[model samples]
Target: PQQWAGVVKVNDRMGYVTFTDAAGTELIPTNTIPVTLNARMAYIYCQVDEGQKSIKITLLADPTGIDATAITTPKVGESGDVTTNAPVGSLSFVSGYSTVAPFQFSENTIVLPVLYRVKNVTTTEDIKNELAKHTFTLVCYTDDIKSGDTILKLYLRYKVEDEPAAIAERATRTSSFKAYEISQILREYTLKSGQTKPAKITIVAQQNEYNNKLEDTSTIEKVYEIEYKTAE
Candidate 1:
């Protein structure tokens, strides 16, 4: 009942697929279609073009492959730590459970503690010290179903060469039930330090559930500001 515009075939490796109709001269689409990795069948978004005779294929790295199995579910703690340690900094909350508030006010750094039950996380071998390339998304939501809009995103990476040895060692063979913190320094004048004005920050962890639904979120809020730091 229909004529196909183009044919796409992928080898062993899995990636996303997108095509541009050449019509003889090429034009690319702004969006992409997914091609499942190692799977026999996949659903794709196909467009029919009457004037198009040729098409071009592109492959993109798919990120959706990562799920709860590799990194497991993470929990955000009520308070963070500020112990100045290598990698996990004490300038703010870094690791372990604490009865007192773990956050130490700093003009430069902000620490948000997260706990993951990873069985064999490390900086070497298969795991590669990857805490699953943890992604941080800032969002505001009025309700569960209303696609919470994202305000900001921060990417976490384990840089081997630039990081201190203690930091890399912390990732080696780290077992389950360990406390880890996502610490970031305020840079590029995003927010001024040494100011009296307090900022309200609330962090919430959402549970991944079926479509159009999210497990109840764990919420924590703190009022603070990035302050200045000096070496002794």
Candidate 2:
């Protein structure tokens, strides 16, 4: 009798990797990366520290029925242990199986922050119209935060005078007041007169811990590029 011991959680290297769909959309980073039952493959995206020698994605133990093999992506350099040569980037896997069982990634894994879908539920035109007001509010929608998870703060990154600037505030979790699955008022933003109108603002969510480790710096971030529109 074989007893399954939940998914694998790794936190060592200061980086991470996540599986993506065929269309290249990033999926949630979970304990175990999933493979399509029909296709039996998963596209990988890796972001690891510099000077990484090599990476090997392998199963923890002998599989029940799956034939696991890491595919070679020449563009990312040849697969397998390249200890003698240069470092590698993206590497994907192809699992051949009749009846498949969940597999654990090798110790050579990266840290991918827990990602969630985020959107600007508020009207952009309204925000543009209120530029003269200097103070405006924007509502953002995010995936549900399960109970016990606390969002430490929301950091907004933008540029001022072509230099980097940031604004951070304590995030509050409240009831959904709009027609959104999860609504969060980002608070009123006071824009400076010299601040560029057509700008890019990045939102980052910091949490208490990642992979249950307080020292880990895994965070979810999104970029929003807003442009000014002509008056209607």
Candidate 3:
């Protein structure tokens, strides 16, 4: 009954492996790296062992995809004597679940902040028109869980931004987003008693209100939180 842990870095176009407890975390095989970043799906996976009797897990920052030299390079098509600009983005953990008696459990959720530049097009009309029809996905997941318990409850929180100056204003929006829920059972052959399993979560971007209204899609940030309790 040993607990496992690790961290992952998620961003646009690139996802990297950061850290893991493969050595002492008996849940994963020796030398096993379980952290996975799926740019195409926009989610990550974390594994834990039920035998260890751990209740909660916290993910910390592990730098991935950072290039000090790239940061010093000038922007493309900039004038002579150009200046370097630090990259901007956001990261967060959104949803999760726990296991009950008799069965194991797994779930997925996504929290992403998308930023798009505003240019040439001016006026709210242009903004509205530009916003429509853009596409993106939300990546989310929970630690592997043992099963047989009923879900007590689940919830989601999120926020959005329109201008560059509002970068820090990552507050939650009121009922402005959508979500899909999935639940299933695994056979004993797939997962035996006292055994640990690994699972993956994913979210796909599709049409949103801005796209439907044809408004300039604003830069946006969102966070989702999922909570569940299982029987012992």
Candidate 4:
């Protein structure tokens, strides 16, 4: 009597694969899929050998839980709703397909792009003096897809007023203040699926305000961009 072998196949959101035995029998298996971190567990599947022979299958744990590192992080000025644009934020590998499959899956995360805003304020000191010493606040707003699990890390980069020559050249112009540039980054964070959080940012002038009150105080919105994904 000759012994017959079988094949095996694996399919699911994680990834897919197949294997066959000497007898040309086929087998199918599913990966240990990830559930929400909040949920804290996943499930996998497999089938018996084709030859009807007794088979032993050993299940192993997922070494890398999930690969949330974004292959394509969100850009600074893209537009889309939370569901379509920002899905759930978790650590998992995402498979891209042209057509939606019956057993397709998606993970969502938040991208805190750099934000900018400018406002005029009134104070007691001379406009120039106040402007020289004044500081502006940068505010970063993020939408939570999960609930309270998402964490946000923020960082900032900025440049003060232009050089003296540049300032002098623009002095004759109607606008009083020189231009200031700013940028922002998400240092790190672990956010839940659905939650909204704000990153507080501030920028202050290191040098004294220029002489003219009109020159001393200036208001311009500073833009900061950031991208975030799940942590491994």
Candidate 5:
């Protein structure tokens, strides 16, 4: 449908890419990069260390942007993600995710310029980033915590960012448990570019026999990338 097109603006060698060595784990960036509406897709360039596993690149949204009334939100009930919190940016044009299965840095070491698309939610085919002004976050995170099949999955939960505690706390929010086991380390997902919004990611540790219990979690989020531009 013509109503489904999302628009973006562009700028640069190909935009931006960031990386860090996992001193035994996939850590969030101590560095930063910039993405614009002008860019084609968000780029994720990765070179998996010689290992026996797939790495996860998780995109998180900041709540401040998502909560911004300045940005026009999508209609109610059709957000796909029904939760107590605001939408994870992208104006509901799309989830702004890879739309594929999962995230991983596969066998192809040195993957370059993976892409993602952006535009308005319906009828409005395109809009300049300058006019679509709003700042939602597009923070990136990845988990290469490989050790067992139990943990070898890419899962996504929505709404709440409850900290992982006993089963009870995990029970409070809506979720997508055991999302999927991540097998490839060289993988990528999509989202628009902007200061954008908020999404949660909680690390739940299994202590005792209650291993693999649910901990803190949030949305795309899973495939998040918030973009900004003033409304024309």
Candidate 6:
């Protein structure tokens, strides 16, 4: 959970990071990272390595608890091009996908992707919103009952901007899926000259099964309770 960057929720917005690997370690050019830190956390760490070429950025702890090993290169999906020269000119659309190498990552869990269109995401206000707000998430997991014991694994989920992330394995004796509402993490950090506030976060889990199914709220058997600490 200490490795890799995950979305940290700061109110209703979110911010994530990307660092290209040059050698064995990730880096940021000349002791600086490229992305701004959002989400909440206590401290952020950056280790400069003369060996690596690019700037590596970070906020400690995998806020969404996404496994680094499970993450992979984004795959651009194939699609037919739409003509824009004749009449209305529409921008080219390119869809991206993230893949997991393992088979049936989990018998009780699955990955879901979401696609949507927005206007002028490059505008200044849009960019700020992406970093300072919109970091709420939904965690869902089923009571793992393969062994038929008092043990079970949970499949939790949430998204960073557009990416859906999750993790599993919590032992308990239950048979339905669990629902949680909150940001993955929160904390204070030192910025510039002693400026400190709760580290920020972003991304909303866009999984339909987790989103729609949980909303039914009709099946009492499938409902599980969530309890968490609200520490400052």
For candidate 6, write residues 37-128 as lDDT tens digits.
34221122333433333343443332232221111111222132111111101111122244211111121122222121222246788755
lDDT of 5 by residue, 47-132 (tens): 23332322333223210111111111133333332323222221222124534221222211111111122222344333333223
What is model 1's C-alpha RMSD? Answer: 19.1
Query: Which regions of candidate 3 fall more than 4 Å away from where they truly are?
Result: 1-109, 118-120, 138-232
The number of clashing residue pairs in each candidate reads: 16, 3, 23, 41, 56, 25
TM-score to true structure, per model: 0.25, 0.17, 0.20, 0.17, 0.18, 0.24
Ranking by TM-score: 1, 6, 3, 5, 4, 2
Model 3: lowest-lDDT 10 consecutive positions: 64-73
**TM-score between model 6 and native:** 0.24
> Which ranges in model 2 have alpha carbons more than 4 Å from their true place?
1-191, 194-198, 207-210, 217-232
Name the TM-score of candidate 4. Answer: 0.17
lDDT of model 1 at position 125 = 60
TM-score of 3: 0.20
Task: Report the lDDT tens digits of candidate 4 across residue range 1-232.
Answer: 2222211222233434333222333323333553222111122233343443324332233221111112112433334211111111111222233311111121222222112211233454544443442222222233322244443322121222434333323222111111112222232123332343323222211121232222333422232222322223
Q: Give the candidate order by descending lDDT.
A: 1, 3, 4, 6, 2, 5
Give one digit per residue, the lDDT tens place, for model 2 in 1-232.
1122112322223345433322234333333644323322222333322232133333333221111222112222233311111111111122333321111222221111121111123577753333221111122222222233223121221111111111112122211010111111211111212222212222232233222111235432332222222123
Q: Model 5's lDDT to the true fold?
A: 0.22
Sliding window of 10 residues with minimal summed lDDT for model 4: 81-90
Q: Local distance difference test, per candidate? A: 0.27, 0.23, 0.26, 0.25, 0.22, 0.24
